[PDB]
Symmetry: D2
Subunit: 257 residues, 4 copies
């Protein structure tokens, strides 16, 4: 709990978190509530999201959301403003991570599976960021003029994609590449934009694993979701982090297989 | 003099998207002049038909939406019908709109972001999966090589400007795909490379006010001008020849590092 | 609130280079205020002695040329003598001259390029090899961790300006080392990370005309100001705590992308 | 031999090539002579360099050169001007590629071996580039104002350094990182600056290899030095290539060991 001078405040800030019913998004939601923030959990899975909001208590709300939907994205923003009056932080954690070869025995990679991965991972992340940015721009200027922080989730697959990861790598590389042009624009509103590229974490995302985990130099294990949430926490607090993609991966460099 | 090579492009068959104009038209001209056969693919029928006509009997055109499963399959079949095989795919089809995340009239449209992704990223994947399937049937040539796939990203994948969220996302996705696709297709002797062009004299650029074009050229350290599409095509030619180039994104940009505006 | 962590920095020992000023002074202040012990290393005896004095009994200073085998070994031994162990090394020592490849008075001096490399790159390697040797003796702590090494590169490793050949080379070398060193030192539970700072309020910067400092701040998208050394130190603190950060270079730069001039 | 409109001419251009007595530098020397250029071979090894110049014929000269020496670098430039009257292209191929762990049984990595690798690979490359640039700036402006091309050699170790490659990776990453600030400056003189990052080639440089070679996705072999020279040739001819590092590696991504 020691902080630097001119650190940004996290207490009483309102977080919008996608994929919040599980894995990384669930961990960010827990971290934020435990740090004294408010959280609006967004997930397509109502059972998981309602359970998470219930477990977190009155600092949390759940809003069922398909992140690729214009309507649902707008409703998520509206839900946050209804509950807590503002939005300060968006963390995009919703994603899918299929494996499918370009060429298999049973044919070429289906176009629909590529399109779906792009839709959820990349279009969904953009949809939430454009709408969250619009809401954040309405905030009064905080310390140094800051109005909000947007944190996206890429993957080490954006850098070291394995056989079978064309769709996933394309989607996450697209997320990564957006960070800079979005940060450049949203600077005039005091909204920072950052991306975390996780390695292998213990989540439902990759539901072979053991072999990947054994290839992680140090620590020689799957990541704890709370370690991803810790980095989110630091990005929120450290105003100089902007426009960058941070690998959070134990120095993993994935092999082709 | 000679250019050291494995793949000899004479009588090999190129499938080229965006071939009615700009970079794809330049690749098509380069390939025909090097003795290759070319199947030009474009949504612009007028431009594509005129290009194939100008190039002569070594060229064919088929009007194609690269994001369509149907049209992609029809394009492969058209190439096989005309020329019996496919050796090289060059994905040049793309759109490069500018639109702010937060505009005067509201947030960036979801539909426009989706369209840019669809044409630039989904279309490139669609053509690569289908071309790879065809190439995998080829007899291995020099050094075991069955084919080469070359995609077009952009410097916007690295230095995206204000207004380029969609374009940067799409081209960053193309760039990031290169490795996992190359790793897999290596098993078939099919190389996968990406070129990230800087600012080139394309139809869109040529349509801009001269004062604007001149300012864009001035942002490029050397040569301090717009790139000529034939220079992009020359790099495509080198990638085809140089078997050691694989799994990489090459910036072709005069050392440009785009500013925010 | 809490910050999720493995390494607890209370009563752990930091070795910090360039500790008399700027970033290294800020790391030293951060570490002492978090309950750590600090061994400040600098060539500037006056600044180093004053810093250790201001920090109190949890700090020591030893005058050290980081590029010297002898001085590096003496520094390790001094830390072990005072505090019994070394847990964290932070390499902040550096020089950032500007000198053109082709100047008015002739080509860039070879001697000045060599000096910048010597201090920034050779000095960082020298201290990391010796600190790693000491850390490898530590009892494994939380999650098997014996130590953390954090190096300082620069945005110049990515976007080097005119005049920065030597600085960019040195800092690009630091950046590129991170992975092979992390891969090896993983066998000892020692993590290796690099921070690439943008424009910070260091002694050199503070000495520039205000008009100049103000223009530099204006080049940074957000926050549109010089970085505070304590913000660099805060990232150092986070790296120590967050065991999953390893083998990476983190830009801490306000989204700055330096122009050529 | 088909070229694009506005291609830069290679015939009768004068190449200065370091490390020219073996491996990649020897291949560039052969390529350039066979393409109708003049070559001044630079190497510390007089036996190898003299043999190479003899084999290439009257289009070639040898000048013994320690690339890290100010005096020898100046003499190399002077030798080129004496023989051929100008310098058009510099290709820096001289390098050493030792393997040494940070921590071994017999102690920490020697400081002297790190310093030597830096000296030859990085300081030597800078030394030759500063002096070649100064000579190139004296040329009359060619097509589009171009006066020269400088091509440096990094390595895949600049990206994917293995255990034991601290020195090599540092040196080659330093080379890579210089490309942009040097290109930015030398643009005013019409001198382009590019870097090639080779993977594993069949040269004396790496005198384990078989395992590395088996990890190269395609082509599944060591690189031919003539393929590196082919890329050099294309960089010389293609004016739009500037300020960039090109991996030439068969899609190799080196594992830790
Ligand atoms: Zn905090
Ligand atoms: Zn040629």
């Amino acid at each position: 709990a020691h902080h630097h001078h001119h650190h940004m405040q996290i207490e009483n800030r309102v977080f919008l978190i996608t994929g919040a019913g599980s894995g990384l998004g669930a961990a960010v939601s827990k971290m934020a509530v435990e740090a004294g923030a408010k959280v609006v959990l967004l997930d397509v899975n109502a059972e998981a999201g309602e359970a998470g909001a219930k477990a977190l208590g009155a600092s949390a709300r759940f809003q069922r959301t398909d992140v690729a939907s214009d309507t649902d994205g707008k409703a998520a923003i509206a839900a946050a403003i209804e509950a807590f009056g503002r939005i300060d932080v968006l963390v995009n954690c919703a994603g899918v991570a299929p494996g499918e070869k370009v060429l298999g025995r049973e044919g070429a990679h289906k176009l629909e599976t590529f399109t779906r991965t792009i839709s959820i991972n990349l279009i969904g992340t953009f949809n939430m960021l454009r709408l969250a940015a619009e809401a954040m721009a309405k905030n009064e200027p905080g310390q140094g003029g800051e109005r909000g922080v947007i944190i996206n989730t890429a993957s080490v697959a954006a850098f070291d994609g394995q056989i079978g990861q064309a769709a996933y790598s394309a989607s996450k590389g697209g997320v990564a590449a957006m960070t800079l042009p979005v940060a450049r624009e949203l600077a005039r509103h005091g909204i920072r934009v950052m991306t975390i590229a996780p390695g292998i974490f213990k989540t439902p995302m990759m539901a072979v694993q053991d072999a990947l985990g054994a290839s992680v130099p140090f620590p020689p294990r799957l990541g704890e979701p709370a370690e991803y949430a810790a980095l989110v926490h630091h990005i929120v607090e450290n105003q100089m982090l902007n426009g960058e993609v941070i690998r959070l991966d134990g120095a993993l460099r994935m092999a082709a297989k």
